[PDB]
């Protein structure tokens, strides 16, 4: 009643002896598969501005004036696991080599090795405020490297058919945050080719579309008529 006992015979497939089946992560590499996580993370990512605008109180709270400016940083010594309490590890771009963040360093290293698996693991790991705050700061100014590294990282991501609703919302957050600079230097060769191969992998997503169209139409017809 408090633990689970093994239904394995005494005398004188450990999941099947403990009556469980831990559902495997994806059944086939040619099958779309959502994230192992809450379903609401997509909606939180897609509309977290209007959700927080809802969540604000109706009038401003009464603070003091002789309040310390670095109140968020002036803790003591249960440790904070946010993007604000992040320290750098171990000659002027937006993030030097001593002041690179973990996301920007892994994005650059994946651009070297042409394998963004650790980048995508960090993206699927951290929280929606951290995701918005990392995508919103992506060096959209002179040569456009960090944008195109993010785009072909998402390409390598949704080639793998896992976490794909999150890779779709990361692309939506990219187009929302600074799709205006992509529209600005449209016909730039690197960013146009990165969007080209993203569309090359992304155009095979209508399998889900006509699959849910069939299921919706025939389910409605069978239930009503």
């Amino acid at each position: 009643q408090f633990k689970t006992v093994s239904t394995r015979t005494i005398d004188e497939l450990n999941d099947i002896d403990f009556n469980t089946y831990t559902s495997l992560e994806q059944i086939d590499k040619e099958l779309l598969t959502l994230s192992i996580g809450p379903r609401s993370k997509m909606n939180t990512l897609l509309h977290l501005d209007v959700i927080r605008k809802r969540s604000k109180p109706k009038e401003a709270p009464k603070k003091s004036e002789k309040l310390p400016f670095f109140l968020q940083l002036s803790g003591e010594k249960s440790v904070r696991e946010g993007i604000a309490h992040e320290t750098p590890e171990e000659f002027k771009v937006t993030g030097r080599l001593g002041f690179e963040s973990h996301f920007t360093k892994q994005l650059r290293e994946g651009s070297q090795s042409k394998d963004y698996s650790s980048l995508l693991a960090t993206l699927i790991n951290f929280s929606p405020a951290a995701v918005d705050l990392e995508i919103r700061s992506l060096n959209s100014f002179e040569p456009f490297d960090e944008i195109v590294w993010f785009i072909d990282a998402l390409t390598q991501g949704l080639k793998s058919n896992k976490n794909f609703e999150l890779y779709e919302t990361f692309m939506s957050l990219l187009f929302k945050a600074h799709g205006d600079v992509i529209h600005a230097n449209n016909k730039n060769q690197d960013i146009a080719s990165a969007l080209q191969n993203w569309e090359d992998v992304h155009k095979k997503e209508d399998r889900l579309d006509d699959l849910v169209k069939f299921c919706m139409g025939v389910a409605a017809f069978v239930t009503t008529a």
């Binding site: 529209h183 169209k213 069939f214 139409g217 025939v218 017809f221």
Partner: protein
């Protein structure tokens, strides 16, 4: 704008909006004085028509269901 309020005369409006969008400069179209009280008028009507035509595509799969029954017939 006022052709898009029909569900009948809306396709002509969408083709004309599309050719304006793909033949003009988007910064010019935004900074023309008066082009937000029009495009805010006709974003929700295009969304209404997208919902309606998408549901037409959704209920277009009774043909596919009837075809799979007609192939199960032997």
């Amino acid at each position: 704008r006022d052709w898009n309020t029909n569900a009948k005369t809306h396709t002509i409006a969408q083709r004309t909006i599309r050719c304006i969008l793909m033949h003009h400069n988007i910064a010019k179209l935004s900074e023309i004085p008066g082009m937000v009280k029009i495009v805010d008028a006709i974003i929700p009507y295009t969304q209404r028509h997208f919902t309606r035509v998408d549901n037409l595509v959704e209920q277009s799969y009774i043909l596919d269901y009837a075809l799979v029954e007609m192939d199960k017939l032997f």
